[PDB]
Amino acid sequence: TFGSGEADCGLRPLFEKKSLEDKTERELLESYIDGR
């Protein structure tokens, strides 16, 4: 909806809500500089 739309916005069930990481998640994370 807005500045952080919904309320439980972008918390994927099968993943975040489940603490499961997808095949290509960390790849993104590493770009934010580093996995440190």
Distance CA 25, CA 10 (A): 14
Residues 1-36 that bind other proteins (CB under 8 A): 1-6, 8-16, 22-25, 27-29, 31-32
What residues contact 35, with CB distance under 8 A and at least 6 apart?
A: 26, 29
Question: Rounded to the nearest whole angstrom, what is the least distance from the CB of residue 34 to other proteins in the complex?
Answer: 11
Question: Rounded to the nearest whole angstrom, what is the least distance from the CB of residue 19 to other proteins in the complex?
Answer: 10
Residues 15/21, Cβ–Cβ less than 8 Å? yes
| Contacts to other proteins by CB under 8 A | 1-6, 8-16, 22-25, 27-29, 31-32
